[PDB]
Amino acid sequence: MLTEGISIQSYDGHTFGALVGSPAKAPAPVIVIAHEILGVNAFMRETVSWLVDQGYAAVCPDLHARQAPGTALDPQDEAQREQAYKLWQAFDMEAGVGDLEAAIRYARHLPYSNGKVGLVGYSLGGALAFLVAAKGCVDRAVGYCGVGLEKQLDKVPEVKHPALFHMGGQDHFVPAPSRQLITEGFGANPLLQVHWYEGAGHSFARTGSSDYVASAAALANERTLDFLAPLQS
């Protein structure tokens, strides 16, 4: 689902929609949400609503718009998971970062903005959140369950503002050696935090997932809100 009429234009003239949640009160910091491989779906709707309830405005851009506008896949359906994996395989990460940078610029200019913008990414969005933190577009970045972080360690010293990462300890995408590489690499830059959730799998914070772990999701989410709170006026 996207908000009708919202259109954000990127570096190369590509435009895309977004689901937008205005804040309960103005002004407010704005959180750009980088979605999973499944697009702007029920979990994104829940995430916008949650951040609005917590004193933010939120903007979830349609990152699959270069491939197919309005992707909103339900992870309960095998056919829809299959379409998501096909979209991910083809997804241009660099163009994703560009679209997120455009969404952040859009977020800064919203009429109720207090001048501060954060980014929170899940899955696909978690890996994009690290890349955006390296570019420095945002005031604070958060990434849940990003894949392939161990292949981006050269970017650790590029991070110049705080970024927080939540990672499952039983995430098959991040096996023991990868976890070790990420832990040692990220540890060199005190602007970064990486927290591991022992006993929790890849989608431990996604409501409805068979991977969901309430205790872990609760702790990660509490940490996220405490990390974002300094952006509030």
> First and final CA of the chain: distance in angstroms?
30
Catalytic annotation present for 99:
no
**Technique used by the depositors:** X-ray
- In three-state secondary structure terms, 231 is helix
Which neighbouring-strand residues pair with 8?
Answer: 16
**Contact (Cβ atoms closer than 8 angstroms) between residue 22 and residue 63:** no
Q: What is the CA radius of gyration of the chain?
A: 16
What distance in Å separates the CA atoms of residue 110 and residue 105, rounded to the nearest whole number? 9
Q: Resolution to 1 decimal, in Å?
A: 1.8
**Domains in the chain, ordered, with CATH?**
1-233 (3.40.50.1820)
For residue 150, give every residue at least 6 positions away whose Cβ sits within 8 Å of its Cβ, in sequence order, or none: 174, 177, 178, 181, 182, 185
SS3 annotation, 56-117: CEEEEECHHHHCCCCCECCCCCHHHHHHHHHHHHHCCHHHHHHHHHHHHHHHHCCCCEEEEE
**Contact (Cβ atoms closer than 8 angstroms) between residue 142 and residue 119:** yes
What distance in Å separates the CA atoms of residue 233 and residue 216, rounded to the nearest whole number? 29
What distance in Å separates the CA atoms of residue 177 and residue 23, rounded to the nearest whole number? 42
Q: Pick the catalytic residue: 35, 64, 166, 202?
A: 202
Catalytic annotation present for 161:
no
Name the maximum alpha-carbon separation found in the chain.
Answer: 46
- In three-state secondary structure terms, 32 is strand
Q: Pick the catalytic residue: 77, 171, 195, 226?
A: 171
Dihedral sign (CA 14, 30, 148, 211)? negative
Number of neighbouring beta carbons within 10 Å of residue 152: 18
